[PDB]
Design an enzyme around this catalytic site. Structure first.
Site, PDB file in Angstrom:
ATOM      1  N   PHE A  72       0.884  -1.187   0.000  1.00 57.38           N
ATOM      2  CA  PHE A  72       0.000   0.000   0.000  1.00 57.38           C
ATOM      3  C   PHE A  72       0.907   1.219   0.000  1.00 57.38           C
ATOM      4  O   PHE A  72       1.865   1.218   0.796  1.00 57.38           O
ATOM      5  CB  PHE A  72      -0.938   0.003   1.195  1.00 57.38           C
ATOM      6  N   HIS A 125       0.582   7.498   2.228  1.00 62.64           N
ATOM      7  CA  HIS A 125      -0.627   8.201   2.545  1.00 62.64           C
ATOM      8  C   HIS A 125      -0.601   8.864   3.934  1.00 62.64           C
ATOM      9  O   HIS A 125       0.214   8.492   4.766  1.00 62.64           O
ATOM     10  CB  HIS A 125      -1.867   7.263   2.570  1.00 62.64           C
ATOM     11  N   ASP A 145      -3.421   9.215   7.127  1.00 59.82           N
ATOM     12  CA  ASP A 145      -4.684   8.582   7.523  1.00 59.82           C
ATOM     13  C   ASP A 145      -5.828   9.597   7.507  1.00 59.82           C
ATOM     14  O   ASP A 145      -5.712  10.802   7.814  1.00 59.82           O
ATOM     15  CB  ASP A 145      -4.594   8.005   8.911  1.00 59.82           C
ATOM     16  N   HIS A 199       3.042   7.564   5.830  1.00 57.09           N
ATOM     17  CA  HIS A 199       3.496   6.244   6.001  1.00 57.09           C
ATOM     18  C   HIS A 199       3.031   5.310   4.878  1.00 57.09           C
ATOM     19  O   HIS A 199       2.171   5.669   4.075  1.00 57.09           O
ATOM     20  CB  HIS A 199       3.024   5.744   7.383  1.00 57.09           C
TER      21      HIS A 199
HETATM   22  C1  LIG Z   1      -0.969   1.251   9.145  1.00 59.46           C
HETATM   23  S1  LIG Z   1      -1.614   1.074   7.445  1.00 59.46           S
HETATM   24  O1  LIG Z   1      -1.665   2.481   6.896  1.00 59.46           O
HETATM   25  C2  LIG Z   1      -3.297   0.550   7.897  1.00 59.46           C
HETATM   26  C3  LIG Z   1      -3.906  -0.067   6.698  1.00 59.46           C
HETATM   27  C4  LIG Z   1      -3.127  -1.241   6.051  1.00 59.46           C
HETATM   28  O2  LIG Z   1      -3.091  -1.303   4.864  1.00 59.46           O
HETATM   29  O3  LIG Z   1      -2.621  -1.994   6.944  1.00 59.46           O
HETATM   30  N1  LIG Z   1      -4.629   0.850   5.847  1.00 59.46           N
HETATM   31  C5  LIG Z   1      -5.830   0.620   5.304  1.00 59.46           C
HETATM   32  O4  LIG Z   1      -6.604  -0.337   5.264  1.00 59.46           O
HETATM   33  C6  LIG Z   1      -5.861   2.042   4.705  1.00 59.46           C
HETATM   34  N2  LIG Z   1      -7.040   2.794   5.116  1.00 59.46           N
HETATM   35  C7  LIG Z   1      -8.149   2.785   4.379  1.00 59.46           C
HETATM   36  O5  LIG Z   1      -8.194   2.232   3.271  1.00 59.46           O
HETATM   37  C8  LIG Z   1      -9.285   3.531   5.018  1.00 59.46           C
HETATM   38  C9  LIG Z   1     -10.341   2.522   5.448  1.00 59.46           C
HETATM   39  C10 LIG Z   1     -11.586   3.281   5.946  1.00 59.46           C
HETATM   40  C11 LIG Z   1     -12.792   2.393   6.142  1.00 59.46           C
HETATM   41  N3  LIG Z   1     -13.154   1.491   4.979  1.00 59.46           N
HETATM   42  C12 LIG Z   1     -14.010   3.162   6.653  1.00 59.46           C
HETATM   43  O6  LIG Z   1     -15.055   3.140   5.958  1.00 59.46           O
HETATM   44  O7  LIG Z   1     -13.867   3.784   7.744  1.00 59.46           O
HETATM   45  C13 LIG Z   1      -4.562   2.271   5.504  1.00 59.46           C
HETATM   46  S2  LIG Z   1      -4.736   3.589   6.827  1.00 59.46           S
HETATM   47 FE   LIG Z   2      -2.529   4.342   7.365  1.00 55.07          FE
END
Ligand SMILES: C[S@](=O)C[C@H](C(=O)O)N1C(=O)[C@@H](NC(=O)CCC[C@H](N)C(=O)O)[C@H]1S
Ligand SMILES: [Fe+2]
Length: 328
Positions: free
Chosen positions: A208, A211, A213, A267
């Site tokens: 990923f 980005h 948060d 991150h």
């Molecule tokens: C620590 S890493 O950035 C966390 C994590 C990952 O891929 O592990 N991540 C996600 O998943 C990414 N965040 C998103 O896509 C947002 C999700 C929001 C969520 N679907 C909602 O409706 O609240 C990002 S925040």
């Molecule tokens: Fe994140």
């Protein structure tokens, strides 16, 4: 690659009535928020081993049929009301990650926001109880356990910023919070599909991309497999894993409110060929919550930012993120 400074902060005083002890916690939060922007919350009171076991049981037993039946709109056009909550499918050969998202359990069909069909509010969808006994109840209780930890952490952030301890928490309420839990599965795959691997400008293989948060703060459980990196002036640094703690960071609403005094750290997620879990709780306020922006670096506390409602913030941010980094 150098290791990021991510201190471990004992947050247990934030649950109690020792105000001096609480200010000493707040200083540690201030320090971490002004440095890399991450810290581990320890002595948080939550049974994370049981969370990871119940989550494993769900991910490893749900079937393809159930995934379609729970799928968000992005995967299943029949489910127009599910933008946020439900199953986010993998695509073998192309997309490795899969996940399940749920919202506030109090968003029931009679809730006034659901009745008004307000954006970002949805009624959660759940698998069949007989196929997943105990899971809904477990997940709903987890929501309230991490809500309680998040409320304590928000008291610490409020103190750290020179405010009264309910400055954020008074906008974080069980009947209306837009906070979400996501149960993310990152699988082991042999062979691992190259199309599911992204490559950063620096060469790093990612799952990923970079980005900020979309949150006020993020409260994250992950397995003990190192994968996260934070951008600092030193370049990207590795965040060590700790499956006994909660990894905490600010999201871009905090950055707005504080005029970037507490930045939302940039991150990204490295590619690791390992079966692991990522279980974020996104601390979101209520749809109409507005906090007047300020600046703790300025003598009069004044900021030249306009107030932004949490609901506007959240609806725009979730769309932008998908556009930036793709549908998860
Ligand atoms: C620590 S890493 O950035 C966390 C994590 C990952 O891929 O592990 N991540 C996600 O998943 C990414 N965040 C998103 O896509 C947002 C999700 C929001 C969520 N679907 C909602 O409706 O609240 C990002 S925040
Ligand atoms: Fe994140």
């Amino acid at each position: 690659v150098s290791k990021a400074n991510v201190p471990k902060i004992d947050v247990s005083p934030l649950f109690g009535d020792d105000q001096a002890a609480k200010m000493r916690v707040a200083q540690q939060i201030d320090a971490a928020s002004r440095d890399t922007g991450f810290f581990y919350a320890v002595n948080h009171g939550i049974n994370v081993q049981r969370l990871s076991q119940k989550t494993k049981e769900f991910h490893m037993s749900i079937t393809p049929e159930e995934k379609w039946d729970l799928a968000i709109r992005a995967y299943n056009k029949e489910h127009q009301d599910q933008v946020r909550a439900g199953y986010y499918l993998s695509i073998p050969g192309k997309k490795a990650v899969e996940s399940f998202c749920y919202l506030n359990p109090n968003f029931t069909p009679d809730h006034p926001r659901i009745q008004a069909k307000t954006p970002t509010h949805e009624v959660n969808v759940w698998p069949d109880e007989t196929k997943h006994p105990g899971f809904q109840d477990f997940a709903e209780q987890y929501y309230w356990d991490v809500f309680g930890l998040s409320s304590a952490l928000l008291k610490g952030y409020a103190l750290a910023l020179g405010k009264e301890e309910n400055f954020f928490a008074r906008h974080f309420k069980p009947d209306d919070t837009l906070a979400s839990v996501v149960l993310i599965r990152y699988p082991y795959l042999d062979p691992y599909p190259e199309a599911a691997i992204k490559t950063a400008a620096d060469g790093t293989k990612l799952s990923f991309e970079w980005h900020e948060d979309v949150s006020l703060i993020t409260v994250l459980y992950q397995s003990n497999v190192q994968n996260l990196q934070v951008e600092t002036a030193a370049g990207y640094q590795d965040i060590e894993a700790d499956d006994t703690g909660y990894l905490i960071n600010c999201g871009s609403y905090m950055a707005h409110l504080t005029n970037n005094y507490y930045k939302a750290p940039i991150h990204r997620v490295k590619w690791v060929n390992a079966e692991r879990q990522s279980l974020p709780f996104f601390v979101n306020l209520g749809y109409d919550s507005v906090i007047d922006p300020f600046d703790p670096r300025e003598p009069n506390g004044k900021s030249d930012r306009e107030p932004l409602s949490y609901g506007d913030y959240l609806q725009n941010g979730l769309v932008s993120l998908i556009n930036k980094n793709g549908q998860t």
